[PDB]
């Protein structure tokens, strides 16, 4: 460690801790900057050399964390929890947790190489015709093909290509990760990940939310299954069984927006799939990001700085460059450089993703003057919810009209059902998936799911919660959890489930603050500077305060609450229930063992 980055000496008490923290933050930004930079260089240009540079940057970060980590424990270990300054306790508790820096050097090098290689496998995997990338090739197949056999080829090829080679590495990663966090006092890495919500009842609280939400999912599921049965027939769809996992428009069946075509209840009302209008009008990536930005500035939030426009990667490079295409928002921790890296495609769903990523950026801009340790969400679900809340307003038929994407205007019950059904295909269909991913990982980290049961337990949870089944046989050679980005990229998922509940709590409060007085699902906060100020207060707090109290200041309640989501969807919740009854549907999938047959031609599309 460079001498300037090393910790000096400090008194063993709170006034020393504060000087410690200032000295730390001074050196942290440089260490953060070089590792973010090196990750950026790699993820926008996947090369062995850039992987090497990133691993060295990560080793440097580990050196930094050990030095300051061990000094913090030398002076402050048995007194930091009684400090008067609550932000200083948060800062100190963070520095004192070493994580992977608890590993000896050799194992640090093993760990960093495992992360690099798992990331490279996921982001460079291809499906070859007897070759397609995940983004855009396989994604567009999953979204637009209605050929059972073709969808099957893409789904199987992707899961086999990404997952199978990842499994031995994921096993070794899990062991080293657990060894590292066990030395910070956590029983396993999952306990560490859950501690970020600072709630002793986290898992029970989540289960209680899901119980309130599940009936909405079960009714959407049965309604969509019926539509699928009309198109693919009784041989490929079982009306009392799980839905084959490749038929819902998305590689993970986690959002069903792309089959809106087949389920739209009132096709004579305005056509809410405005993707074609975007293409007819010549929308490109940069337009999408400029339209998102202007929503933020309409609220008197900040525009994207010039460094964002000059540095960001907003389209997949066409110059023969391997990149990580999975969207991300980047804080370089120098208070100046903030970027998005998205392989943006011209679709309405991608326009919502653009807002989601820009919501991350806006957070970074508002708290860039906090101590680096407090530059994060009040919890990770907050950070994930910011852009989604704004996109809730953007998605309304009235707002789409304002921005030229929906010429025809209506305000009637059929049009509302259409719109709420389309929104539910994104927000309701996602809830079981957002909930199950880290149930799987928590069981792996705890050891209840050994490698011998990685896929058995994944599909147990996929069937239990999502009511889907794999369309070809799977065994423990397959590692289908590894075919989802966040798993090999070692980044948690429960934040998205929390965000999907939170974002409707946020939406209700912002709409009220803007003075909006109609149905919650027709609120558009565009140009509400009062709504903007209320959101800005949340953004500026970073993690300086407990998320339960930031929440109460914003929405008037100190807990996650499903009621705003339920209120938003109430009309289509009622309607789907009626429709399923009148069709004599079975809610659920009591033929839990059922899987579809293979196409007679298979393999062939
Ligand atoms: C789409 O239409 C709905 C429904 O409009 C209502 O029903 C129609 C059949 C007509 O009879 C309308 O004249 C009637 O208002 C609109 O929702 C409604 O919005 C108004 C405000 O614009 C609400 O009235 C307010 O009620 C609050 C109490 O909550 C009072 O404090 C206010 O002073 C004001 O009178 C009305 O409650 C609301 N209805 C429902 C069921 O929420 C909606 O605005 C419209 N959408 C668009 C985009 O134009
Ligand atoms: C599109 C979105 C990408 P994201 O912005 O959430 C992305 C996922 C990710 C995580 C680690 C490394 C690389 C990427 N997260 C980020 O870019 C940010 N670092 C989020 C952040 N949160 N606090 N500071 N930053 C996403 O993954 N959504 C879920 C629902 C999904 N598509 O499965
Ligand atoms: C696991 O599966 C491997 C892949 O074979 C393909 O998938 C299996 C599940 C069957 O559907 C088979 O018809 C496919 O060819 C097999 O090579 C392997 O032997 C299977 N068993 C084990 C223990 O790995
Ligand atoms: C990609 O990385 C290589 C080093 O691995 C570098 O020489 C090259 O300039 C990079 N390409 C771009 C477009 O940055
Ligand atoms: Cl999380
Ligand atoms: Zn995000």
Numbering used by the authors: 1 to 130, 136 to 610
What does the paper say about this structure?
Angiotensin-converting enzyme (ACE, EC 3.4.15.1) is a zinc metalloprotease which has traditionally been known for its role in blood pressure regulation via the renin–angiotensin–aldosterone system (RAAS). Although formed from a single polypeptide chain, this protein has two catalytically active extracellular domains, the N- and C-domain (nACE and cACE, respectively), which are separated by a short linker region. We, therefore, investigated whether the 33RE backbone contains a unique property which allows it to take advantage of this hinging behaviour of nACE by determining the mechanisms of action for a range of ACE inhibitors differing in their backbones and degrees of N-selectivity, namely: omapatrilat, enalaprilat, SG6 and ketoACE-13. This included kinetic studies using the S2, S′ and combined S2_S′ mutated nACE (S2-nACE, S′-nACE and S2_S′-nACE, respectively), as well as solving high-resolution crystal structures of minimally glycosylated nACE with the combined S2_S′ mutations (N389-S2_S′-nACE) in complex with SG6, 33RE and omapatrilat. N389-S2_S′-nACE contains mutations in the S2 subsite (Y369F and R381E), S1′ subsite (T358V) and beyond the S2′ subsite (S260T, E262S, D354E, S357V and E431D).
Previous kinetic studies reported that 33RE was a high-affinity inhibitor of nACE (Ki of 11.21 nM) and had ∼1000-fold selectivity over cACE with S′-nACE, S2-nACE and S2_S′-nACE mutations, respectively, leading to decreases in binding affinity of 22-, 254- and 900-fold. This shows that the S2 mutations have a greater effect than the S′ on 33RE affinity of nACE and that upon combining all eight mutations in S2_S′-nACE, a synergistic effect occurs so that the affinity for 33RE is similar to that seen for cACE. 33RE is bound in the S2′ to S2 subsites with its amide group located in the typical peptide C-terminal binding site composed of hydrogen bonding from the amide oxygen with Gln259, Lys489 and Tyr498, and a water-mediated interaction of the amide nitrogen with Lys489. The zinc-binding group of 33RE is a phosphinic acid that replaces the P1 backbone carbonyl of a peptide and forms a bidentate interaction with the zinc ion as well as hydrogen bonds with Tyr501, His361 and His365. The P2 group of 33RE has a peptide-like backbone with the carbonyl having a hydrogen bond with Ala334. The 33RE P2 sidechain, a tetrazole, shows hydrophobic interactions with His365, and hydrogen bonds to two water molecules that are also bound by the Gly382 backbone nitrogen, Pro385 backbone carbonyl and Glu389 sidechain. Comparison of the 33RE complex structures shows that all interactions with the P2′ to P1 groups are conserved. The only significant difference in interactions is observed with the P2 group of 33RE, as a result of the Y369F mutation. In the wild-type 33RE structure, the hydroxyl group of Tyr369 interacts with the tetrazole side chain of 33RE, and this interaction is obviously removed by the mutation to phenylalanine.
